[PDB]
Amino acid sequence: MKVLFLTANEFEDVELIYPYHRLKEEGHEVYIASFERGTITGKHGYSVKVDLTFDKVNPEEFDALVLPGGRAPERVRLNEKAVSIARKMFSEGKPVASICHGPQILISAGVLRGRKGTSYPGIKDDMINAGVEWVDAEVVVDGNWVSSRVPADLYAWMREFVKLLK
Amino acid sequence: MKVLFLTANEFEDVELIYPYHRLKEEGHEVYIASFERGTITGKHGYSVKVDLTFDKVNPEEFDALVLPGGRAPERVRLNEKAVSIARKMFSEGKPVASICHGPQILISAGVLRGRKGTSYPGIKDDMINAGVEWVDAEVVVDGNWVSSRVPADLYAWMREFVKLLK
Amino acid sequence: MKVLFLTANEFEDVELIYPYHRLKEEGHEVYIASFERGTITGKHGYSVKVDLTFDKVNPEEFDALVLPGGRAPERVRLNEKAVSIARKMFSEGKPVASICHGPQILISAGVLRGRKGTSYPGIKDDMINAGVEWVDAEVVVDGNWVSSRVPADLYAWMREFVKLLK
Amino acid sequence: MKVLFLTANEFEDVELIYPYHRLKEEGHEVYIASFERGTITGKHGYSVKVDLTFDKVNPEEFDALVLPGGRAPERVRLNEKAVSIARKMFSEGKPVASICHGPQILISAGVLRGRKGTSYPGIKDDMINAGVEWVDAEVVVDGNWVSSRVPADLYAWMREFVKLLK
Amino acid sequence: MKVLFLTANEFEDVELIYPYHRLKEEGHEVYIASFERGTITGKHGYSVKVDLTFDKVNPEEFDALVLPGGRAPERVRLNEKAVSIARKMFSEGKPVASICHGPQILISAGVLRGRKGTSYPGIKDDMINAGVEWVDAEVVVDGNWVSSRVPADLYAWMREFVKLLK
Amino acid sequence: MKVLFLTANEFEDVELIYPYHRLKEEGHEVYIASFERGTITGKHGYSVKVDLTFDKVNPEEFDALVLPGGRAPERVRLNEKAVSIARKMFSEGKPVASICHGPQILISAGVLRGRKGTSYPGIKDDMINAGVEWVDAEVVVDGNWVSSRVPADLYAWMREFVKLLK
Numbered sequence: 001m002k003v004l005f006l007t008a009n010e011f012e013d014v015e016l017i018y019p020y021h022r023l024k025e026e027g028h029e030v031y032i033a034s035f036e037r038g039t040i041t042g043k044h045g046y047s048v049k050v051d052l053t054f055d056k057v058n059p060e061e062f063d064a065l066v067l068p069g070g071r072a073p074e075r076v077r078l079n080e081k082a083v084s085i086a087r088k089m090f091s092e093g094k095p096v097a098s099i100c101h102g103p104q105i106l107i108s109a110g111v112l113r114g115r116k117g118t119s120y121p122g123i124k125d126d127m128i129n130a131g132v133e134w135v136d137a138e139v140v141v142d143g144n145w146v147s148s149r150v151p152a153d154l155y156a157w158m159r160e161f162v163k164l165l166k
Numbered sequence: 167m168k169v170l171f172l173t174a175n176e177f178e179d180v181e182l183i184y185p186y187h188r189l190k191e192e193g194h195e196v197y198i199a200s201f202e203r204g205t206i207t208g209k210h211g212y213s214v215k216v217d218l219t220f221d222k223v224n225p226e227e228f229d230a231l232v233l234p235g236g237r238a239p240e241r242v243r244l245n246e247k248a249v250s251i252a253r254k255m256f257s258e259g260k261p262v263a264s265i266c267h268g269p270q271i272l273i274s275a276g277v278l279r280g281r282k283g284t285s286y287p288g289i290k291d292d293m294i295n296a297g298v299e300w301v302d303a304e305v306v307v308d309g310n311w312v313s314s315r316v317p318a319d320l321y322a323w324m325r326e327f328v329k330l331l332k
Numbered sequence: 333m334k335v336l337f338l339t340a341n342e343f344e345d346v347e348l349i350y351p352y353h354r355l356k357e358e359g360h361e362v363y364i365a366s367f368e369r370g371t372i373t374g375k376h377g378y379s380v381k382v383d384l385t386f387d388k389v390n391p392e393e394f395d396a397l398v399l400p401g402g403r404a405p406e407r408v409r410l411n412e413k414a415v416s417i418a419r420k421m422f423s424e425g426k427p428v429a430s431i432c433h434g435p436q437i438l439i440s441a442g443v444l445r446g447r448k449g450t451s452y453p454g455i456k457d458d459m460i461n462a463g464v465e466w467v468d469a470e471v472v473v474d475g476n477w478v479s480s481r482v483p484a485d486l487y488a489w490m491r492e493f494v495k496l497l498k
Numbered sequence: 499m500k501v502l503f504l505t506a507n508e509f510e511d512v513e514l515i516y517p518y519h520r521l522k523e524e525g526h527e528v529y530i531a532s533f534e535r536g537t538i539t540g541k542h543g544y545s546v547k548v549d550l551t552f553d554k555v556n557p558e559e560f561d562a563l564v565l566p567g568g569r570a571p572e573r574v575r576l577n578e579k580a581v582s583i584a585r586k587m588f589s590e591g592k593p594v595a596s597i598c599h600g601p602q603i604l605i606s607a608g609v610l611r612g613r614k615g616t617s618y619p620g621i622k623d624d625m626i627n628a629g630v631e632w633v634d635a636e637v638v639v640d641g642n643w644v645s646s647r648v649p650a651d652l653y654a655w656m657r658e659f660v661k662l663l664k
Numbered sequence: 665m666k667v668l669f670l671t672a673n674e675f676e677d678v679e680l681i682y683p684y685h686r687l688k689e690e691g692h693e694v695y696i697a698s699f700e701r702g703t704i705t706g707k708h709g710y711s712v713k714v715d716l717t718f719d720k721v722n723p724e725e726f727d728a729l730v731l732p733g734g735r736a737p738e739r740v741r742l743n744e745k746a747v748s749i750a751r752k753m754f755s756e757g758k759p760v761a762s763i764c765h766g767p768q769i770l771i772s773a774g775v776l777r778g779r780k781g782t783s784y785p786g787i788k789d790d791m792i793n794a795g796v797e798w799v800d801a802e803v804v805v806d807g808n809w810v811s812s813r814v815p816a817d818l819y820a821w822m823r824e825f826v827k828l829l830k
Numbered sequence: 831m832k833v834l835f836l837t838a839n840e841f842e843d844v845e846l847i848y849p850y851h852r853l854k855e856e857g858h859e860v861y862i863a864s865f866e867r868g869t870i871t872g873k874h875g876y877s878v879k880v881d882l883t884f885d886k887v888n889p890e891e892f893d894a895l896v897l898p899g900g901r902a903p904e905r906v907r908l909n910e911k912a913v914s915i916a917r918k919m920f921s922e923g924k925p926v927a928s929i930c931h932g933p934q935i936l937i938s939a940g941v942l943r944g945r946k947g948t949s950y951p952g953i954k955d956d957m958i959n960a961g962v963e964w965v966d967a968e969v970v971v972d973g974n975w976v977s978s979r980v981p982a983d984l985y986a987w988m989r990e991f992v993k994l995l996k
């Protein structure tokens with residue numbers, strides 16, 4: 001499986017780095033997409049290499065999608081190409097993992113009405129207004145959509161996501 | 167006029183400090199309300215004294231409301247008392263000024279359906295999903311609601327808000 | 333009115349941003365002059381665009397002058413052209429607003445002998461030794477010179493300065 | 499399984515957080531031991547709660563040990579109780595995972611002579627002088643000792659360590 | 665010889681630490697005085713222990729005085745007791761070393777008229793207005809007063825100061 | 831005398847700056863060697879200019895060597911040219927001063943077996959395993975090798991090193 005990550009500067013560091021390594025453990029290939037090639041830096045100063053730009057992503061080449069949190073999703077969700085990648089992959093039923101502010105990208109994609117999941121609690125009202133049945137749980141599994149709230153939830157978030165890719 | 171500010175740690179510094187001083191220039195009394203007494207610190211490190219807690223606010227004692235941005239609104243909007251203050255003041259037609267992420271508190275108050283305004287562009291989709299006709303302008307005036315987007319808009323934001331309080 | 337600001341890196345952020353927006357509210361044009369074009373960054377990390385260099389300033393083209401504080405005045409006061417701009421504008425009786433360390437530029441211009449005003453209290457002795465009757469007040473108005481001490485004084489500083497430009 | 503972590507302030511954040519969550523995914527209980535109760539803060543600013551002090555650790559109550567890196571191991575290795583915990587657990591054949599500077603604690607425990615493993619390359623010479631057959635690989639498995647070098651190795655480090663605990 | 669240092673938070677780190685150690689090399693005793701007991705922290709984050717408060721200093725018990733720079737002198741120079749210590753020691757002809765902003769304390773003491781020395785160039789005009797014959801040199805020796813400008817001057821600053829204490 | 835420093839980014843600031851100025855006081859020439867020309871930055875943010883790269887160093891052109899601490903030695907000790915400079919200078923009996931983590935470079939050079947000295951206590955075990963008779967003292971003098979532990983030892987470290995160069 002080829003797993004795509006849509007992120008940008010000010011990503012929540014462990015929310016990117018944890019699934020990156022957890023999915024590599026399984027033998028999956030992992031790719032970081034952002035605005036430009038080079039590096040991006042997390043809220044806490046970890047730097048990661050960008051593999052490809054949003055413009056170069058062909059969603060048909062990727063099997064699954066991860067949406068880390070932090071302040072990066074509010075930047076990503078204004079990029080039509082990044083939102084279109086998330087819209088396509090999610091609506092096609094490919095596995096999509098989101099955490100914390102990550103699902104702001106899915107809100108903007110317009111794909112969450114009637115879906116069941118969670119997010120950082122600070123944006124619960126925005127998830128509800130997008131039509132989500134919002135649950136206060138460490139992980140929620142709604143078909144292809146695996147969602148979690150905060151870094152304390154990482155263990156449960158990927159415990160469930162790895163099952164979808166098997 | 168007695169002007170109330172609803173804010174918390176990680177407020178956008180100039181979005182609090184600018185209206186605070188601008189309204190004092192007019193002779194209005196300005197009050198900072200937050201979770202606890204003591205001080206709160208902005209994203210950029212400016213410290214301000216808290217005048218009263220959300221619990222101690224009686225909305226009937228205040229004439230107008232200011233909602234600065236930053237990351238503070240995502241904290242404030244989870245406090246039922248703070249959201250109730252905003253709901254009451256806004257729904258009674260008292261002047262309410264919001265900037266950047268500030269109107270996340272108004273989203274949570276459930277008062278924006280059918281209203282027109284603006285915000286930080288990163289949350290435009292959340293404003294639209296709350297029932298706002300979102301306008302990309304430095305300031306929008308919709309009856310009692312004066313809204314702006316970013317720090318570059320400060321001059322226009324308070325130019326319009328000062329007029330409502332006269 | 334065309335209002336010139338003389339500043340540099342490590343300016344006290346709100347002491348630049350507050351008068352910048354306050355004077356734009358009135359419809360005045362505001363210009364940031366510094367060592368080079370591009371941007372400058374405040375003590376607290378706010379970035380502002382430089383409109384023109386000190387070398388390109390013709391003082392006859394500007395109606396008023398603002399001198400924010402921070403650590404920037406100790407840099408500005410070593411630039412002969414910046415000091416000459418301040419000397420010319422102040423000595424011609426044009427409105428000049430200073431706050432905090434801002435009047436270090438006026439000290440270096442040699443224009444304060446026999447004048448009355450204020451500054452950041454830490455440099456009161458230097459103001460006295462330059463020939464200033466130093467007053468511990470939130471704002472002092474001495475003809476064309478409007479002076480204040482610290483960020484807490486912003487409201488009173490521009491309340492008085494706006495009156496000189498009308 | 500009950501997994502003990504020996505660490506301190508200035509731990510490499512992801513080297514603690516990654517195995518903590520990865521092992522919780524398996525249903526293992528995870529315990530952070532340090533100098534004092536309260537919190538410890540990583541090099542990159544993540545804070546974690548300390549479960550127990552080194553003085554309160556009874557090594558017989560834990561099944562496995564994790565030694566994250568950063569600057570914390572040079573502090574931990576001067577605490578004779580922490581070193582004695584590592585010596586006891588490692589010499590009894592319990593699973594021990596180390597990464598980056600983590601095995602400095604094992605050097606001080608005097609248990610690495612004739613063993614095979616890796617570390618941050620900057621301390622390879624110190625591992626060699628302690629009697630280690632040093633290997634430049636993302637993960638090395640030498641009986642109970644699973645060792646890795648840097649954060650890029652996380653995926654492989656816990657892939658192998660999880661196998662020892664099953 | 666007993667050497668006193670008058671300083672406070674935001675001292676220029678190397679301007680305190682360098683003379684501290686250089687004078688200990690000679691066998692002199694070194695004492696840090698500040699507003700309160702406990703620790704003070706430099707601009708660059710080095711922490712030093714305060715030996716005594718300004719209020720507890722009896723200038724007759726000390727043989728020489730060092731005035732480091734940074735932002736600390738603008739705080740120290742508003743403390744009547746600290747200024748009185750500097751006034752007494754300097755006017756009695758005891759060796760006094762200053763660097764960078766350090767001599768702002770001597771300006772406030774009122775002891776520099778007709779004296780010859782240097783400082784951080786940003787405050788040269790303030791030194792001149794206090795009656796100093798200001799010299800742009802790495803070190804100036806004017807009887808008991810040894811003055812330097814910036815951290816690059818440290819070697820020459822103490823080369824000359826150690827000669828006065830011999 | 832021409833004194834070479836082998837260092838890199840994340841050097842302990844005062845451990846480089848202190849001997850640099852102390853040795854310049856004597857009239858010695860001081861040279862900073864690192865990976866590349868330009869500047870290097872300490873743990874605490876002080877920046878220093880690099881005079882030459884490790885590749886350009888001819889050890890026969892330098893009379894003495896200084897090895898500051900911080901995290902820089904773990905980078906320097908993986909550069910075989912830097913290690914070969916230290917090996918050559920130390921084994922030829924030229925004066926070598928080390929402090930804190932500085933002697934990690936000497937460990938890697940393979941020159942400490944049977945020698946007597948000190949270091950940061952956190953790496954004492956690594957010094958012992960390299961064949962050092964490790965002493966817990968502020969300064970140790972073993973022929974050409976002058977060693978100290980921490981920044982508190984600076985005064986004694988250079989007191990002894992200066993004697994070797996005279």
Ligand SMILES: O=C(CO)CO
Pocket residue numbers: 279280281294297298299300
């Ligand atoms: O129509 C708006 C909601 O009222 C969104 O554009």
Ligand SMILES: O=C(CO)CO
Pocket residue numbers: 445446447460463464465466
């Ligand atoms: O008299 C002033 C100078 O004119 C100082 O107080």
Ligand SMILES: [Tb+3]
Pocket residue numbers: none
């Ligand atoms: Tb051997």
Ligand SMILES: [Tb+3]
Pocket residue numbers: none
């Ligand atoms: Tb041996």
